[PDB]
């Protein structure tokens, strides 16, 4: 058993920085849209509505030459997505 899936919650924070540790630090520190696809598909499942789709689309960017979500972006939107930091 190499991949591991889990359900959401308050420690979905541990999820987002744990996949940040699998995907974003073996050697990348910048995970692109495609990484977000493997991420949200196999690390858990999905979120809700079109704004978590914002997660998925904003990860890349407007042009998308080499835009990726590095050290913080994936947990900062994950923290606002779950708890909301406004």
Protein architecture, described:
- With 86 residues, this protein is mainly alpha-helical.
- It has one domain (1-86): EF-hand (Recoverin, domain 1), CATH 1.10.238.10.
- Helix content is 52%, strand content 0%.
- It has four helices and no strands.
- The N and C termini lie far apart (39 Å).
- The relative contact order is 0.20.
- One of its GO terms (molecular function) is calcium ion binding.
Explain the layout of strands and helices:
Layout: H1 12-23, H2 33-43, H3 49-60, H4 73-82
Put the structure in a nutshell.
With about 90 residues, the protein is mostly helical.
Domain module count = 1
The CATH architecture classification is: Orthogonal Bundle
CATH topology: Recoverin, domain 1
The assigned structural class equals mainly alpha
Q: What is the beta-strand fraction? A: under 5%
Radius of gyration: 12 Å
Major sheet, described briefly?
none
Question: What is the H/E order?
Answer: HHHH
**Number of helices in the DSSP assignment:** 4
Q: Superfamily at the CATH H level?
A: EF-hand
Defining key terms:
monomer; 4 helices; EF-HAND family; Recoverin, domain 1; 52% helix; 86 residues; 0% strand; globular; metal binding protein; mainly alpha
């Amino acid at each position: 058993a190499a991949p591991k899936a889990r359900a959401l919650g308050p420690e979905e924070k541990d999820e987002c920085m744990k996949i940040f540790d699998i995907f974003d630090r073996n050697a990348e520190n910048i995970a692109p849209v495609s990484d977000t696809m493997d991420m949200l598909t196999k690390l858990g499942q999905t979120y809700t509505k079109r704004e978590t789709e914002a997660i998925m689309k904003e990860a890349r960017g407007p042009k998308g030459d080499k835009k990726n979500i590095g050290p913080e972006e994936w947990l900062t939107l994950c923290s606002k997505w779950v708890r909301q930091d406004d």
